[PDB]
């Protein structure tokens, strides 16, 4: 096999979505074999697997256009251990959900919430499936602050293309 090795998928950039920024950003990483910038998604293929593998862990989590950047290995996996919550109109936050989660016999490695809007929805992930299914069945349909919160897994693996 010679597929996955040099290709990093970036998030959608604003009106400033051009190779100019991609080069000025991914520049200090290695000889970019090629670059792609489309309204909605970006891609960058390095001439060296190392340069790519690094840029993926470097660029990922960066800042640009007053927004958090995101980069990954242009590719798709299978199965996961994360779930999303709904009907949770509360402030908690990652710290809150993480506190109750760990206290409820549920260890998580990643957490996220949505405070920007009043949708009242969050998302958590566990290191193992056991905790996922357990926490999902233990959290599914629960009364809290006079509100019934529910948890449901949501897998969104990029199209096969």
Curated annotation (Swiss-Prot):
Name all RRM domain ranges. Answer: 6-76, 81-156
PTM Phosphoserine: at which residues? 63, 93, 105
Q: Which superkingdom? A: Eukaryota
**Post-translational changes noted in the entry:** Methylated by HMT1. The methylation is required for nuclear export.
Record localization: Cytoplasm; Nucleus; Cytoplasm, Stress granule
Function of the protein: Involved in mRNA processing and export. Required for efficient splicing of a large set of pre-mRNAs by efficient co-transcriptional recruitment of the splicing machinery. Remains associated with the mRNP during early steps of translation elongation.
Q: Fill in the subunit field for this protein.
A: Interacts with RRP6.
The similarity comment for this entry is:
Belongs to the RRM GAR family.
> Miscellaneous notes for this chain?
Present with 78700 molecules/cell in log phase SD medium.
**What protein am I looking at?**
Serine/arginine (SR)-type shuttling mRNA binding protein NPL3
- Name its species: Saccharomyces cerevisiae (strain ATCC 204508 / S288c)
Taxonomy of origin reads: Eukaryota, Fungi, Dikarya, Ascomycota, Saccharomycotina
């Amino acid at each position: 096999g010679e597929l996955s090795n040099t290709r990093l998928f970036v998030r959608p950039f604003p009106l400033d979505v051009q190779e100019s920024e991609l080069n000025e950003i991914f520049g200090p990483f290695g000889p970019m074999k090629e670059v792609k910038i489309l309204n909605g998604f970006a891609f960058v293929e390095f001439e060296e697997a190392e340069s790519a593998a690094k840029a993926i862990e470097e660029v990922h989590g960066k800042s640009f256009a007053n927004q958090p950047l995101e980069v990954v290995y242009s590719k798709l996996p299978a199965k996961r251990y994360r779930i999303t919550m709904k009907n949770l109109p509360e402030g908690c936050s990652w710290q809150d959900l993480k506190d109750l989660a760990r206290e409820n016999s549920l260890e998580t490695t990643f957490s996220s919430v949505n405070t920007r809007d009043f949708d009242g929805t969050g998302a958590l992930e566990f290191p193992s499936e056991e905790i996922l299914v357990e926490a999902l069945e233990r959290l599914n349909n629960i009364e809290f602050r006079g509100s019934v919160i529910t948890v449901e897994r949501d897998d969104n693996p990029p199209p096969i293309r």
